Amino acid sequence: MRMDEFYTKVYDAVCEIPYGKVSTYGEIARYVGMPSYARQVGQAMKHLHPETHVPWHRVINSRGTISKRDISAGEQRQKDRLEEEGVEIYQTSLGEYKLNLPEYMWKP
DNA sequence: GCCATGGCTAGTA
DNA sequence: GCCATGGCTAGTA
Numbered sequence: 001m002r003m004d005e006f007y008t009k010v011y012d013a014v015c016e017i018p019y020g021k022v023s024t025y026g027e028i029a030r031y032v033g034m035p036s037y038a039r040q041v042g043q044a045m046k047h048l049h050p051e052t053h054v055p056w057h058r059v060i061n062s063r064g065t066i067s068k069r070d071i072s073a074g075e076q077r078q079k080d081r082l083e084e085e086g087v088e089i090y091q092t093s094l095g096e097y098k099l100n101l102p103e104y105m106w107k108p
Numbered sequence: 109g110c111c112a113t114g115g116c117t118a119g120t121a
Numbered sequence: 122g123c124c125a126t127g128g129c130t131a132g133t134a
Binding site for chain 1: 124
């Protein structure tokens with residue numbers, strides 16, 4: 001499979017995560033049949049434009065935290081979105097935001 | 109080509 | 122560890 005397809009397949013899968021659930025880079029990656037490709041799902045999400053109607057906020061790492069995402073710390077926005085979805089998050093010592101995976105985890 | 113740089117993470121320590 | 126992108130440079134031609 002070529003990139004650009006992959007992407008389309010990701011976004012498809014991401015568009016499938018239910019309102020108020022979530023998944024992880026890792027899961028998605030395996031979902032679309034390329035388990036080794038977490039990081040890239042990462043990047044697929046990165047490249048989307050704001051105007052997207054693709055649920056990129058519903059994807060976080062396997063440690064139930066909002067991925068660091070150093071460049072453009074304006075990922076604060078991912079938090080907001082997720083709260084208004086009802087999902088409930090808190091911070092940590094060392095900052096970060098985090099939630100209860102077993103609950104919110106989309107178990108397809 | 110070799111190398112650093114990422115919204116990573118299963119399995120060690 | 123895994124793996125794409127993209128910016129350097131040995132060193133072929």
